[PDB]
Design an enzyme around this catalytic site. Structure first.
Site, mmCIF file in Angstrom:
data_model
loop_
_atom_site.group_PDB
_atom_site.id
_atom_site.type_symbol
_atom_site.label_atom_id
_atom_site.label_comp_id
_atom_site.label_asym_id
_atom_site.label_seq_id
_atom_site.Cartn_x
_atom_site.Cartn_y
_atom_site.Cartn_z
ATOM 1 N N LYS A 149 -29.536 81.651 44.141
ATOM 2 C CA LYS A 149 -29.306 82.002 45.527
ATOM 3 C C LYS A 149 -27.869 82.400 45.761
ATOM 4 O O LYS A 149 -26.944 81.799 45.212
ATOM 5 C CB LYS A 149 -29.652 80.828 46.452
ATOM 6 N N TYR B 95 -25.188 74.759 44.016
ATOM 7 C CA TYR B 95 -25.545 73.498 43.370
ATOM 8 C C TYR B 95 -24.591 73.055 42.281
ATOM 9 O O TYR B 95 -24.673 71.917 41.827
ATOM 10 C CB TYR B 95 -26.977 73.556 42.820
ATOM 11 N N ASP C 187 -35.757 75.951 40.433
ATOM 12 C CA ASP C 187 -34.993 76.397 41.591
ATOM 13 C C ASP C 187 -33.547 75.912 41.545
ATOM 14 O O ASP C 187 -33.289 74.711 41.595
ATOM 15 C CB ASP C 187 -35.680 75.909 42.868
ATOM 16 N N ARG D 266 -42.821 63.599 35.774
ATOM 17 C CA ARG D 266 -44.137 63.686 35.156
ATOM 18 C C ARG D 266 -45.248 63.466 36.183
ATOM 19 O O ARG D 266 -46.294 64.109 36.125
ATOM 20 C CB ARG D 266 -44.247 62.682 34.013
ATOM 21 N N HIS E 237 -29.310 82.484 50.466
ATOM 22 C CA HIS E 237 -29.498 81.032 50.626
ATOM 23 C C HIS E 237 -29.659 80.611 52.078
ATOM 24 O O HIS E 237 -30.416 79.691 52.372
ATOM 25 C CB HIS E 237 -28.303 80.309 50.004
#
Ligand SMILES: NC(=O)c1ccc[n+]([C@@H]2O[C@H](COP(=O)([O-])OP(=O)(O)OC[C@H]3O[C@@H](n4cnc5c(N)ncnc54)[C@H](OP(=O)(O)O)[C@@H]3O)[C@@H](O)[C@H]2O)c1
Length: 315
Positions: A79, A50, A45, A273, A112
């Site tokens: 977005k 960003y 995403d 992880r 967005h």
């Protein structure tokens, strides 16, 4: 594990959140996105906002080049930022995102936010009082431009983000609607579980995608430091102990069991992880009820900057 979207495409139910604040060096997104893919994340995403699509895109290309994955194995989201809601700006915005990421298409393109902003240079055009300079745009026209992006093959699927039920309804009831939004990506976690919105989305075959599922990054720009820290919640911690997991894993698993697709941001190798372990255990009905009891209408993103916007989704 994926869910089938209302346009026939498939979305992995666990996604990797790539946003990091500007104080984090841009190169970090490259490193952590590769780690996420190595750990098993396939849904990634991102967004124009960003300032990381070039790095995230490079990570994806790198993992395709070394044979770890093929492009079709990755579900990449970008977005449309709020200064690009005017319909003529939508396709160019998507093309810019594709150029940055060096991808031929995005799997998903979202509006967005419904809070339209004045178009121009700044991502966040603001007045002298700190509030963002708003633009009044009929979002149905923005949506029509999104539909054209899907028809052109630039986006496999299109959806929205930060819409409330009424705003979704406005799109769904638009005359001549060609494509329903496949999803609504919204703030969603045990302190703000969006149960009514979830019920509505399910009734329209719109997937609810949860962001800040771990309680947000608590950025001082938008989040009150006084707000209780989600992962410090005693019910979540007791459940973590019961299951020998972690509060984060409990919060992620909660969403999956409600049929919510869940994002998880981590820039830490160990936590990246750890987060894929969400598929390794289950919560009981009583566990789920305990988590449902935490609901307290707490949206972490809570700033004047946008609480005064005409299209602010919360009430
Ligand atoms: N559509 C929108 O308006 C919108 C808004 C916000 C978010 N998003 C998307 O959703 C993503 C996730 O939301 P978010 O950024 O608010 O963050 P989040 O997923 O709620 O994560 C919050 C924090 O949890 C920590 N964390 C991750 N795994 C953990 C674990 N196993 N144990 C303990 N802590 C853990 C991370 O810190 P570390 O990095 O140090 O591990 C992270 O900063 C974003 O990156 C973005 O892709 C979209």
């Amino acid at each position: 594990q994926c869910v089938k979207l209302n346009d026939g495409h498939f979305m992995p139910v666990l996604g990797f959140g790539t946003y990091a604040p500007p104080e984090v060096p841009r190169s970090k997104a490259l490193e952590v996105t590769k780690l996420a893919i190595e750990a098993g994340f396939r849904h990634i995403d991102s967004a124009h906002l960003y300032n990381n699509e070039e790095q995230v895109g490079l990570a994806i290309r790198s993992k395709i080049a070394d044979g770890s994955v093929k492009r079709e194995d990755i579900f990449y989201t970008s977005k449309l930022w709020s200064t690009f809601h005017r319909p003529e700006l939508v396709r160019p915005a998507l093309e810019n995102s594709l150029k940055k990421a060096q991808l031929d298409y995005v799997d998903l393109y979202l509006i967005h936010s419904p809070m339209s902003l004045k178009p121009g240079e700044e991502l966040s055009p603001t007045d002298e009082n700190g509030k963002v300079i708003f633009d009044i745009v009929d979002l149905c026209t923005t949506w029509e431009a999104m539909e054209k992006c899907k028809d052109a093959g630039l986006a496999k699927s299109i959806g929205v983000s930060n819409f409330n039920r009424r705003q979704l309804e406005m799109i769904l009831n638009k005359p001549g609607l060609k494509y329903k939004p496949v999803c609504n990506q919204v703030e969603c976690h045990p302190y703000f579980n969006r149960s009514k919105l979830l019920d509505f989305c399910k009734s329209k075959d719109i997937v609810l995608v949860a962001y800040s599922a771990l309680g947000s990054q608590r950025d001082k720009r938008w989040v009150d430091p006084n707000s209780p820290v989600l992962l410090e919640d005693p019910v979540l911690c007791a459940l973590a102990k019961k299951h020998k997991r972690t509060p984060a894993l409990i919060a992620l698993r909660y969403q999956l069991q409600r049929g919510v697709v869940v994002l998880a941001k981590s820039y830490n190798e160990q936590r990246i992880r750890q987060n894929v372990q969400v598929f390794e255990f289950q919560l009981t009905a009583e566990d789920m009820k305990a988590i449902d009891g935490l609901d307290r209408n707490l949206h972490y993103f809570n700033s004047d900057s946008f609480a005064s916007h005409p299209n602010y989704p919360y009430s």
